[PDB]
Symmetry: C2
Subunit: 310 residues, 2 copies
């Protein structure tokens, strides 16, 4: 569980989050090494992404060099997971991708999935060697030691550290919400890829803050605010998910062997690109109605209820 102290410094409460996320990371290491399921690496990656996002949003809680160090180490750790995560995600989409194609184009996906399987085993081997290596080991020891340091840092170099948690929460949640509503209002009928990609990140940052600060508020207010968000984050999530999938298939299309075997594969990958592009235009077409619903009296009300008297 993540239980925050309502009256503690934001320093104490961020250290609690990092104890929590590093414990999740260590608790998922066995399942990753034994390759039980994709969810072990997913939870490992979410722990990292959550930690980095709060460290950036609450910049000034730790000394600049310690912050830069934590961000750089967690970024490196996340980058080390990417190839293995990609293998899992695309192997998991095998039946979905197969079911989009005409019967005539499916046999060309067999070698494609066989190759992803071989790349998974390689990527799994590489990540396990990195996990049991001394660079990972030393960083996690140091990170664990640092977040066990209760001393407030120099206020002049870490001016947010000594601040009351409730006020930082109020301030950062309202800022994150405003950034979502303003960027969302600015997106006219053009509804560009750049516009939606930014807005997904904005929504992610707000959801991370809400989830971190949850235990400060009456649990009903937090659940309702998280719910009020869900359709917008789902829509942006799906739009970006489909974008990343098409970038992957597009890049594979560029490196396909220039031979008869490659022709067949190119036809199947063109099938998936075409189908996914069509899906993503439906998701784009739904954005404005979904944002309009979120940009309401009810949203403002639920946020005022969440943050009452802070």
């Amino acid at each position: 569980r993540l239980q925050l102290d309502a009256h503690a410094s934001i320093h104490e409460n961020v250290r609690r989050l990092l104890q929590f996320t590093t414990s999740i990371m260590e608790a998922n290491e066995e399942g990753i090494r034994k390759d039980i399921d994709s969810e072990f690496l997913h939870d490992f990656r979410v722990a990292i992404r959550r930690s980095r996002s709060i460290l950036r949003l609450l910049n000034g809680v730790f000394d600049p060099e310690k912050t830069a160090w934590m961000l750089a180490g967690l970024r490196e750790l996340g980058k080390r997971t990417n190839d293995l995560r990609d293998s899992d995600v695309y192997l998991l989409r095998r039946e979905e991708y197969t079911s989009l194609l005409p019967p005539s184009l499916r046999p060309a996906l067999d070698p494609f999935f066989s190759d992803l399987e071989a790349d998974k085993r390689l990527h799994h081997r590489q990540f396990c060697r990195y996990l049991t290596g001394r660079e990972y080991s030393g960083f996690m020891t140091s990170l664990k030691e640092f977040i066990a340091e209760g001393e407030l840092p120099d206020p002049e170099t870490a001016p947010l550290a000594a601040e009351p948690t409730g006020d930082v929460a109020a301030k950062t949640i309202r800022k994150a919400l405003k950034k979502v509503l303003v960027h969302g209002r600015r997106t006219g009928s053009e509804t560009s890829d750049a516009e939606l990609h930014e807005l997904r990140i904005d929504c992610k940052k707000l959801r991370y803050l809400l989830e971190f600060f949850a235990s400060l508020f009456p649990p009903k207010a937090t659940a309702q605010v998280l719910r009020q968000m869900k359709t917008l984050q789902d829509n942006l999530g799906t739009f970006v998910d489909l974008t990343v999938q098409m970038e992957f298939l597009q890049s594979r299309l560029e490196t396909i062997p220039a031979d008869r075997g490659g022709i067949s594969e190119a036809a199947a990958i063109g099938g998936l690109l075409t189908t996914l592009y069509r899906k993503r235009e439906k998701v784009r077409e739904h954005f404005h109605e979904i944002f309009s619903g979120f940009d309401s009296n009810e949203t403002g009300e639920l946020f005022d209820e969440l943050l009452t008297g802070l």
Copy 2:
């Protein structure tokens, strides 16, 4: 116009149809040669298809050898149009096909359409040389001479020739209708390609007979029967149209150059194959409701009204 004599032999009335269809064919020759529009060759082809279909359905109206001769000559003439017709049809689908693909896959269609354009000019040249040649010229002279021969043929070798038009119409329309209803009832949930392809032909034969015999009936009864059919023939037409398109794209996919240029083209053609396969499954899924609607009291009633006292 096609005006049948209600009390004449079916011999006289089939000869009227053939005078009519050969006049349409000759009247479309200038437009084809000057390449005005695709509709000139379309009407030329429909005239041929209509003539062949009635000659087969009313086998016994002419001597066997004259029938075999007319069918073989009209088949050859139709085959001579196929390459030019295919060029027209696929060039006409340029914007449709382009609009199905993601922006990234469209540039690969440019060389594809450029090649279809070059094949059109070649096919147009070949068909014009055939039209002004002596084999086409001699067959059309002979066909025109033969259908101007009013003598009834030997009843023993052409036993249908002397029959009253109204009774042949009644008999052939009820047979064509029964073949549609029976083959349609036999198609269970499997709704196979073979099942729908046959049923399209069955419907075509019924529509050709209705259109040939139109002027025998009160014009309202014929219009209503043609209307009652339309949704079924449209559905089968579209299903087969999409099938033929996918066979064309599939065959082009097999002969794509095995090089980097071909990879890009294969991706675009796979996009079209995938999209068209999806469209055709929606059309297949609509068949049973549409056939159920046609297989009704109202259909039986309209046909009884059409054929009353024959």
